[PDB]
Amino acid sequence: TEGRSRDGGLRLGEMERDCLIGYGASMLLLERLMISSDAFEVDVCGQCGLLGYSGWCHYCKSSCHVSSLRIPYACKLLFQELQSMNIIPRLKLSKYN
Amino acid sequence: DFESEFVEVLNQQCFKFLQSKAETARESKQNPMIQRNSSFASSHEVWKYICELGISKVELSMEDIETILNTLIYDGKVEMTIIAAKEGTVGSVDGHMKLYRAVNPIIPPTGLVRAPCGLCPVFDDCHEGGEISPSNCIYMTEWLEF
Amino acid sequence: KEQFRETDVAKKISHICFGMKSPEEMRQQAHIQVVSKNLYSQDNQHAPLLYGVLDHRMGTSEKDRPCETCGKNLADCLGHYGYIDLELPCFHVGYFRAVIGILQMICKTCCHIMLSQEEKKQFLDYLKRPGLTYLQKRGLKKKISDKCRKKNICHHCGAFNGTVKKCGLLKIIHEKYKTNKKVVDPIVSNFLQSFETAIEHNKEVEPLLGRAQENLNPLVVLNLFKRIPAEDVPLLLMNPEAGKPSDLILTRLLVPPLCIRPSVVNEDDLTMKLTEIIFLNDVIKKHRISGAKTQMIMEDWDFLQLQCALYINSELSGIPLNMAPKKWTRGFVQRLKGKQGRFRGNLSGKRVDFSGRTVISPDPNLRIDEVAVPVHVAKILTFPEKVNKANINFLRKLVQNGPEVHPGANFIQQRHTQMKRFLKYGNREKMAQELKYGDIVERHLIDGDVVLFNRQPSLHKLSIMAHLARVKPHRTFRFNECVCTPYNADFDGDEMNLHLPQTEEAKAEALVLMGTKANLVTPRNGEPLIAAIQDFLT
Amino acid sequence: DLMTYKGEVLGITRFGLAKMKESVLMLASFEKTADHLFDAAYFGQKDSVCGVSECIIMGIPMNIGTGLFKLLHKADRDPNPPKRPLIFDTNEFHIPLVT
Amino acid sequence: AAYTFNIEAVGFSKGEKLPDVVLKPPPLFPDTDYKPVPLKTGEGEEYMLALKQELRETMKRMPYFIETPEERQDIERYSKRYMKVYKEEWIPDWRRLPREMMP
Amino acid sequence: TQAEIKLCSLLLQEHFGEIVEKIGVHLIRTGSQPLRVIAHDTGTSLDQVKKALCVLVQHNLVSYQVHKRGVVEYEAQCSRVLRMLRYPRYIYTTKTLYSDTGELIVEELLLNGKLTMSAVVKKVADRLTETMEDGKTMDYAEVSNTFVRLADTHFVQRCPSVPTTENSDPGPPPPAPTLVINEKDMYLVPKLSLIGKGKRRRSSPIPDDGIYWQANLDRFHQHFRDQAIVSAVANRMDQTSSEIVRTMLRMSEITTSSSAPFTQPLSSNEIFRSLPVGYNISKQVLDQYLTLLADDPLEFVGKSGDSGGGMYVINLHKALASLATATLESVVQERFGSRCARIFRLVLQKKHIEQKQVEDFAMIPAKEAKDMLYKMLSENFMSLQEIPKTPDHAPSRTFYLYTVNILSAARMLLHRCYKSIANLIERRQFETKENKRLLEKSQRVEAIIASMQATGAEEAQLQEIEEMITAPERQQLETLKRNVNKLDASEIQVDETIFLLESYIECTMKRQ
Amino acid sequence: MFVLVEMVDTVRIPPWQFERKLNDSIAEELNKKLANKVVYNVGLCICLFDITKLEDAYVFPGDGASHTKVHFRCVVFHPFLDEILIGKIKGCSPEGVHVSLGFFDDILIPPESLQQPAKFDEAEQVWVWEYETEEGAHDLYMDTGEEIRFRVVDESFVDTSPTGPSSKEAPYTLVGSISEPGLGLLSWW
DNA sequence: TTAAGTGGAGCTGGATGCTCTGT
DNA sequence: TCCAGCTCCACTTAA
RNA sequence: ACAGAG
Ligand code: SF4
Ligand SMILES: [Zn+2]
Ligand SMILES: [Zn+2]
Ligand SMILES: [Zn+2]
């Protein structure tokens, strides 16, 4: 949350992101802006690219292409504000090698 | 409107007076140049029979039926030709005279209305894999039984 | 007996491919149909209507009443969609500048594209090359519309194709029957004389028929776009595997789940706009049955184009005065743009935890790579120390001290479990004798931890460095005054931030890359910044 | 050299950056956030996740800095090991029957 | 409750008779007042219906109907010569066809 | 044209297969392609592209032209594949003007695409050995006698033939040899002295090399053009006024082109001669008809001349406009009612009209007509003009004029038909997919009857056919066949709705 | 009756197993995920036969474990069609003869493919066989499980996958026949 | 005489720093 | 409060 | 929405 009265916590701004890139710290930028805010997992269908639930892709009516992806939560918020806008963010996943 | 349930019987009344006159020309079978002229009815003559039947107390006036006779064109059932007023019992139009003959429709109805896809209100939403498919349709499966 | 199944299906993202859905793939994604306009029932149960917006078959937005589609709480469910049907088609407010761009390049009689044959052979071979970038796709539609708008007769049917331009808020005109001072053409003569019926009962038709053009509506451009040939769709620069030209006009509208719109904001701005769309689905439908005039149908249908446009983007330019909003509502666009949007407020920079902010004060008895963290902050900011062979006898004592004595632990966590036992309750000398190899002790911040150290206007990269914390009892952050030059701090009521990393990799990237002993020079020209300051030069 | 590598002097505006950078998220996380989204929806434009500002949004680690090389593990292992011999199905004992 | 837009701009100048709110959604198949025209019958219309079944039974058996190539058969045996689906092979006129298509 | 691409993937599926439609539909969908990028943009092997194009160039469904660097690019024809649905309508209409010999000549040309005159008279002699008995053989001579009469009435035309390589471009071989069509010998048959007898299927050096014959699918359309116009004249006046239109059009066969608003005008002095002798009609009664058909505001015919007595022409494009008018109004009456079709004919004649004049001119009240006005704009049958008062274009300061556009409603109504046929094919291929259990069960019990039918066939296999449990199952198989007879017959009858629409769209396109 | 099946995988080796050789630790982990399990199109996977190619062992960011790609051949029980085995009896039912094959238990010998003199039991679960001279209608397939001989004429796979959101039927079936001369108990021949 | 390619003028839509600390 | 694109309209050359 | 602080 926002402020001291709400037990808020501090903000990695738009400019302190620009300073961690200058050091080349990649995993520290990952730990500050993904893991210690809003780490989350999503059922991503690799076939069509949409988002499923509990292994059940209601689009394809099948359960053989769902998969789990490490994502921030404010991106999963973004990928469903945009499907309501009819701007469909179809993903395509591959193996993590 | 004048009345909805009053004009629905005059649509049934004028065409029977316009078809049987052509049938008396059709059963005449003398000369198709004259059989065509024996098919046209006068615009004043068609007024003289409908007022004689005595269906309603209100007057079926001449200025009213002249607008009622346009509806039989719009069902594709009669024509209308305007000729010059050379001779007639009245000649209600100055220098002109209107004629009426009943006709058949031009073609038999097309093959699209014989299909269940043609008359359906949810025609646009039907597709292969989803809910509304022809594989699980009520409109066909009712129509294919009888 | 039992069939194989892959246990942990982890995959990496490769490429994000935008697009759009057809209005019969929206039916395949959602679960219910939304027909009711009213949010809550008339009784005291605070339960929403069972076929409207805020239905709990579309995800949950509170812990109290769980969802209905998958029976889980707020902390588990991803959210599920619903759809609204429209009895009249409408434009989508984003695609409207590309609805005009297609009607400039295709005909409006045969729906084919307006190019000669040698011109069609050139671009369809230009789009075959590998490595085709997004710049080389945007520049090509500029060149094709330079060729299509110079031609006004079709090479396939032969109809006249005048220009296509905007004539108001979401209205498209088409100059098919423009007139000139020259000899009257046969195609402009026949249209301008077939007005004989309308002039008979209406006198004002005669002055106003000099401006009569083909006003295009969503009912026409839905019909025109279903007949575009799919050999000529890629010369509209649309990708045919991400959307159709029939999809740019919406006849069915998805609603977001309740994870997108909270229950107590009471209701969100995008909830209140979905009430006004469903209500104007039943006002327009009422005037179709009860026989209103066309000047009331085209009036109420102007609202449905508007109430879907402000639903998406609530800062339009050319709204008439009788239809402008009185109060300000957030559309989908205004919660994507700006400083408090997604891309500047919640994605590129976001509020973190394991942080601290306190007034600073000087101390030269520390080294140049140290920082004095107070005891009140060091008891709160913890680090997950994984138990292994080296630190087991150290972490047993740090568990046995507890959450109050300073070298202690606030939590404990077992090997394959995801819960945390708060270490104040229960006996701690039993939980210290039951530690296994692989449990996680969350010990207090102690002497030697790597912690970052930030001042809030961060100009260059030495405005954030990593120091080695050393706990001291007083209530400030404290560091040697040789480090007042990189941060530009001055100790006059000045506050600085703190960030404790939580992973070992984040420790090692903070200690080697971002150390104070490894950043003694600025990257600008190579001059030293951590050096002597006043009272160390005098 | 960043301003002049496409034969034209491009600015550091939102118009010079819209000719240098290709990623839709990098274009739309800076200025004119909505128009790039509808344009990438229209063109069907696929985007890569190779750049920096769209690795931070997607939560994958960036390619610059410490994310440019991969660490292997020096395991005591035998690649392409000695296999087990097939006894029954060899080539010299199973000439097929048909001509 | 008043909304963002003006209801008076929409209509409703009397102040009453708002349209009703739908509780249960409409079904997938709304019933129609009218039915399709029945088929055109006769001895001349029926023979076209008979030959159309005699084309699916004929054109599937033609050598143009290229059947999909089989694969991943298990092993060889002696019951293969009895089950070999025999079908003659047609050669085209290569004077018409391009050179680029010989088998 | 998303409906045409879905239908072409069905017509190539039942008639040609699964691994051949991937090559044909992809040329309708994408465009002109060399052979190597067809396999890359589909994913098939290079051998299957050699098999799937040689069948599609056999039946003339794909064409080709030479380009830069000698590459060979193909191009499928969308309208030519959609006419594979009218194959039973092409075999039946040659059974009228020609005998059962000529019925099987075109049926060999349509199923095989291209044949030689040496081969087509063989199979018609072969396949008619079953239709005769008692030693009577079908000879090669009279089949050719029907074949040369087919070329006289233009139902069979020569293919665009290969040129002579010894006269044009000798030397290295070109990849695509640039085939070309001649104007003289489209119907000039080669002479044949060869005769013979057909084989009865007992199961126990070429003169016309390069001269290939294919079916003229345009002439059957010109033959179906006449029967639509004549029957439209037939229903209005009389059978006697019907034959006069049939008299001119049979004379107007060989003298006008496929797209002409006006044919060559006929003089009545030779109309009386070519009129059949079994009609009790004088030359004066002949001049009675020809002046009253021009008086009809349908205007099937025109005068267009004065020399040589009575000079008379017949319209073609105005007649197809009247046919597309009766097509566009017979679909309103069956979907929205009879009273709704009263309004669509009103706005058709009174070209631009408002709400107040419709309820007056048709005697349909308020709140009964406004439902039937609004459901036609929603189904794209009627359009608005919206003449403004101001350039603000506000709905409170303008008029709304209802206006029927025929041509935009003629393409849309045709687009409804292409999806309508494909939905019929999907229903038939659904009930046959889910019931291959029952048809194999009807196959096996008849295989006991079929296999060992006469050779060593005892009578102890006739009563064991109905012994299987299929005997109460026969109620569903009769329900399956009565569906197919209503699906495939409705599948043919929509082509009548297509052809009246397809001829009206073809005559208004200039192709400039 | 055993065949080989070649697959690929990515094997996570946790860092508490680095003291042991990689090839001795890959083979244990693959048997913890494939043994006594029917991979869908290939049959019942008994165990690993050999590992044929072992690529490099990446360490991905965010983990200490090493992930390596493994090419390997697994011995799999999959008989070809009409292979004649020897099998035992567990019990009988009106649905058919339930034949055990050691590790595997779901074999169908249906009454539609039993021997011709006896086809329907006398409301006894145990199946019968009638011969005129000796043992008339009182022969029985004994529940003690003597060895029979049969012929697997039909095999069929079913996709046993979760349908619906996640918060026992056999995916490997087998249908045989006994009607041939020489198929049945070994005591008869 | 006019078709057409290119100048100049007005309209339009976008943007304008980072956080905590309280009412 | 400041600044690039988009569209309308006169202004010469050329046939 | 306003005031502060660096
Ligand atoms: S739902 Fe079925 S019957 Fe109705 S239009 Fe679609 S396919 Fe035809
Ligand atoms: Zn899916
Ligand atoms: Zn849920
Ligand atoms: Zn056109």
Sort C354 into a burial class: Cβ within 10 Å, 0-12 / 13-18 / 19+. Answer: buried
* Strands C421-422 and C409-413, bridge-based pairing: antiparallel
Q: Which residues of C377-406 are buried (b: 16+ CB within 10 A; e: fewer)?
A: bbbebbbebebeeeeeeebbebbebebeee
- Listed by number, the residues of chain G in 84-143 with a beta carbon closer than 8 Å to a beta carbon of chain E are none
| Cβ <8 Å between D61 and A26 | yes
Q: Which of F420, F240, F401 is nearest to F331 (CA)?
A: F420
Q: Pick from C3, C7, C505: which is nearest to G40 by CB?
A: C3
Residues C402, C406, C412, CA angle at the centre, nearest 5°? Answer: 35
Instruction: Tell me the residue length of chain B.
Output: 146
The span from the CA of G77 to the CA of G74, in Å, is 10
Local structure of residue D13 (DSSP, 8 states): S
Angle, helices F140-152 vs F100-112, to 10°: value is: 70
The span from the CA of D51 to the CA of C231, in Å, is 34
| Amino acid at the residue C356 | G
Q: How far apart, in Å, do the first and last CA atoms of chain C sit?
A: 85
The span from the CA of F129 to the CA of F126, in Å, is 6
Q: Which of F84, F71, B117 is nearest to E99 (CA)?
A: F71
In the annotated binding site of C for Zn(2+), the residues are 67, 70, 77, 80, 107, 110, 154, 157
SS3 state of residue C198: helix
> What is the residue extent of each domain of chain G?
1-79, 80-189
Are the C-beta atoms of C387 and C377 separated by less than 8 Å?
no
Phi, psi of F424 (to 5 degrees): -70, -35
Are the C-beta atoms of D81 and C524 separated by less than 8 Å?
no
CATH class of F220-318: mainly alpha
Instruction: Consult the annotation and say whether D14 binds a ligand.
Output: yes
Six-digit token pair at C119?
Answer: 């011109």
The span from the CA of F485 to the CA of F482, in Å, is 5
Six-digit token pair at E92?
Answer: 């085209």
Tell me how far CA of residue C354 lies from CA of B24, C346, C351, C379, in angstroms: 104, 18, 10, 12
The span from the CA of C224 to the CA of C110, in Å, is 9
| Residues whose CB falls within 8 Å of the CB of residue G17, separated by 6 or more in sequence, listed in order | G25
Which positions in strand H are less than 7 Å from the protein's CB atoms?
Answer: 5, 12-23
| Cβ <8 Å between E4 and C327 | yes
Tell me how far CA of residue E90 lies from CA of E65, E68, F49, F62, F120, in angstroms: 12, 17, 16, 19, 16
Choice from B112, B114, B119, B120 to test ligand 1 binding pocket (greatest atom count within 8 A of CB)? B120
| Cβ <8 Å between A31 and C502 | yes
Local structure of residue B102 (DSSP, 8 states): B
Give the nearest chain G residue to E75 (CA atoms). Answer: G80
Beta bridge partner(s), residue C165: C173
On the CB side of C3, how many CA atoms lie within 13 Å of its CA?
A: 16
CA F358, distance to chain mean position in Å, is 39
Are the C-beta atoms of C439 and C412 separated by less than 8 Å?
yes
Sheet holding C382-386, edge to edge: C382-386, C440-444, C409-413, C421-422
Sort G100 into a burial class: Cβ within 10 Å, 0-12 / 13-18 / 19+. Answer: middle
Q: Is the Cα torsion angle F220, F222, F228, F231 positive or negative in sign?
A: negative
Q: Pick from B113, B122, B137: which is nearest to E36 by CB?
A: B113
The span from the CA of C234 to the CA of E4, in Å, is 41
Are the C-beta atoms of C449 and C383 separated by less than 8 Å?
yes
Q: Is the Cα torsion angle F193, F197, F201, F202 positive or negative in sign?
A: negative
Tell me how far CA of residue E15 lies from CA of C303, C524, E10, F129, in angstroms: 19, 72, 12, 86
The span from the CA of C135 to the CA of F374, in Å, is 45
H or E element at residue F225: helix F219-236
Alpha helices in F57-153 (DSSP H): 78-82, 87-97, 100-112, 117-127, 140-152
Partners for B (CB, 8 Å, 3+ pairs)? C, E, F
| Cβ <8 Å between E80 and D96 | no
Using a 6 Å CB cutoff, which residues line ligand 1? B 116-117, 120, 123, 126, 132, 134, 137, 139-140; F 423
- Residue F367's CB: how many other CB atoms inside 10 A? 11
Angle, helices F338-349 vs F369-377, to 10°: value is: 70
3-state secondary structure E24-65: CCCCCCCCCCCCCCCCCCCHHHHHHHHHHHHHHHHHCCCCCC
The span from the CA of F31 to the CA of C73, in Å, is 52
The span from the CA of F249 to the CA of F102, in Å, is 23
| Residues whose CB falls within 8 Å of the CB of residue C62, separated by 6 or more in sequence, listed in order | C74, C263
Tell me how far CA of residue G91 lies from CA of F368, G130, G188, in angstroms: 76, 19, 19
Give the DSSP per-residue string, F434-500: TTHHHHHHHHHHHHHHHSSSSTT--STTSTTSTTSTTTTTHHHHHHHHHHHHHHHHHHHHHHHHHHH
Local structure of residue F139 (DSSP, 8 states): B
Q: To the nearest 10°, the Cα dihedral for F426, C33, B120, F29?
A: -50
Give the DSSP per-residue string, F150-196: HHHTTSEEE------TTTS--SSPPSS------SSTTS-PPP-----
Give the DSSP per-residue string, G74-140: EEEE-PPTT-EEEEEEEEEETTEEEEEETTEEEEEE-GGGS-SS--S-SS-SS-EE--SSSS-S-EE
Are the C-beta atoms of G59 and G65 separated by less than 8 Å?
yes
Closest nt by CA–C1' to C494: J6
Beta bridge partner(s), residue C466: C452, C515
Tell me how far CA of residue F138 lies from CA of C18, F99, F123, F204, in angstroms: 67, 13, 10, 20
Widest distance between CA atoms in chain C: 106
The span from the CA of E91 to the CA of F54, in Å, is 10
Six-digit token pair at A33?
Answer: 């802006």
Nearest CA-CA distance, residue G80 and chain E, Å: 7
Which positions in strand I are less than 7 Å from the protein's CB atoms?
Answer: 4-5, 7-8
Find chain C residues with C-beta within 8 A of A83's C-beta.
21, 29, 81, 254, 256
Q: Which of F262, F220, F267, F261 is nearest to F247 (CA)?
A: F267
* Distance, Å, C162 CA → I13 C1': 27
SS3 state of residue F266: strand
| Cβ <8 Å between G69 and A53 | no
Choice from F423, F424, F425, F487 to test ligand 1 binding pocket (greatest atom count within 8 A of CB)? F423
Six-digit token pair at C351?
Answer: 């509020």
Task: State the method.
Answer: cryo-EM
Phi, psi of F346 (to 5 degrees): -70, -50
| Amino acid at the residue F374 | Y
Local structure of residue C343 (DSSP, 8 states): I
The span from the CA of C521 to the CA of C531, in Å, is 10
The span from the CA of G155 to the CA of G149, in Å, is 17
Q: To the nearest 10°, the Cα dihedral for C82, C87, C91, C92?
A: 0
Beta-strand runs (E) in C26-115: 32-33, 82-91
The CATH number of domain F319-408, selected from 3.40.718.10, 1.10.10.10, 1.10.357.10, 3.30.450.20: 1.10.10.10
Q: Which of G115, G116, G93, G118 is nearest to G106 (CA)?
A: G93
The span from the CA of C378 to the CA of C406, in Å, is 8
Angle, helices F408-431 vs F2-14, to 10°: value is: 40
The CATH number of domain F2-82, selected from 3.20.20.140, 2.40.30.20, 3.40.50.720, 1.10.10.10: 1.10.10.10
| Residues whose CB falls within 8 Å of the CB of residue G173, separated by 6 or more in sequence, listed in order | G106, G108, G155, G156, G157, G158
The span from the CA of F372 to the CA of F385, in Å, is 19
The span from the CA of F238 to the CA of F221, in Å, is 25
Six-digit token pair at F47?
Answer: 């051998």
| Amino acid at the residue C458 | S
| Amino acid at the residue C200 | E
* Distance, Å, F38 CA → I13 C1': 49
SS3 state of residue A81: helix
Ligand 4 centroid from CA C246, angstroms: 18
Q: What does the radius of gyration of chain A's CA atoms come to, in whole angstroms?
A: 17
Residue the block writes with tokens 């025929």: F406
CA F296, distance to chain mean position in Å, is 30
- Residue C106's CB: how many other CB atoms inside 10 A? 27
User: Which residues 317-336 in chain C have a CB closer than 7 A to strand H?
Assistant: 317-318
H or E element at residue B13: helix B4-26
The span from the CA of C249 to the CA of C225, in Å, is 9
Widest distance between CA atoms in chain F: 95
The span from the CA of G118 to the CA of G130, in Å, is 6
Are the C-beta atoms of F350 and F401 separated by less than 8 Å?
no
Q: Which residues of G101-126 are buried (b: 16+ CB within 10 A; e: fewer)?
A: beebebbbbeeebbbeebeeeeeeeb
Nearest CA-CA distance, residue B137 and chain E, Å: 8
What is chain E's percent helix, strand, coil content, to nearest 5?
A: 25, 0, 75
SS3 state of residue C224: helix
Local structure of residue D77 (DSSP, 8 states): -
* Distance, Å, C136 CA → H15 C1': 27
The span from the CA of C458 to the CA of F289, in Å, is 99
Local structure of residue C352 (DSSP, 8 states): -
The span from the CA of F461 to the CA of F448, in Å, is 7
| Residues whose CB falls within 8 Å of the CB of residue G5, separated by 6 or more in sequence, listed in order | G39, G42, G43, G45, G73, G74, G76
H or E element at residue G23: helix G22-34
Are the C-beta atoms of C164 and C172 separated by less than 8 Å?
yes
Q: Is the Cα torsion angle F141, F146, F151, F155 positive or negative in sign?
A: negative
Instruction: Consult the annotation and say whether A64 binds a ligand.
Output: no
Choice from B112, B128, B132 to test ligand 1 binding pocket (greatest atom count within 8 A of CB)? B132
The span from the CA of F69 to the CA of F154, in Å, is 39
Q: Which of A61, G55, F406 is nearest to B130 (CA)?
A: A61
Q: Is the Cα torsion angle C155, C161, C166, C172 positive or negative in sign?
A: negative
- Residue F59's CB: how many other CB atoms inside 10 A? 19
Q: Pick from A24, A25, A71: which is nearest to D59 by CB?
A: A71
Are the C-beta atoms of A62 and G172 separated by less than 8 Å?
no
Closest nt by CA–C1' to C101: I6
The span from the CA of C502 to the CA of A12, in Å, is 15
| Residues whose CB falls within 8 Å of the CB of residue C39, separated by 6 or more in sequence, listed in order | C48, C49, C52, C53, C54, C267, C271, C275
The span from the CA of A55 to the CA of A41, in Å, is 12
3-state secondary structure C137-165: HHHHHHHHHHHHCCCCECCCCCCECCCEE
Tell me how far CA of residue F502 lies from CA of A24, F90, F421, in angstroms: 67, 17, 15
The span from the CA of C240 to the CA of C22, in Å, is 12
SS3 state of residue E86: coil
Residue the block writes with tokens 């001055």: C490
* Distance, Å, B41 CA → H9 C1': 70
The span from the CA of C1 to the CA of G104, in Å, is 8
The span from the CA of C4 to the CA of C377, in Å, is 50
The span from the CA of F358 to the CA of F374, in Å, is 13
Residue the block writes with tokens 């099998």: G87
Beta bridge partner(s), residue C113: C106
| Residues whose CB falls within 8 Å of the CB of residue E97, separated by 6 or more in sequence, listed in order | F54, F57
- Domains F220-318 and F319-408 are alike in CATH topology: yes
Residue the block writes with tokens 């001279």: G133
Are the C-beta atoms of A93 and D49 separated by less than 8 Å?
no
- Nearest ligand to the CA of A64 is 2
Local structure of residue F511 (DSSP, 8 states): -
- Listed by number, the residues of chain C in 479-508 with a beta carbon closer than 8 Å to a beta carbon of chain G are 503, 505
Six-digit token pair at A57?
Answer: 């892709």
Are the C-beta atoms of C507 and C450 separated by less than 8 Å?
yes
Q: CB of A51 within 8 Å of any CB in chain D?
A: no
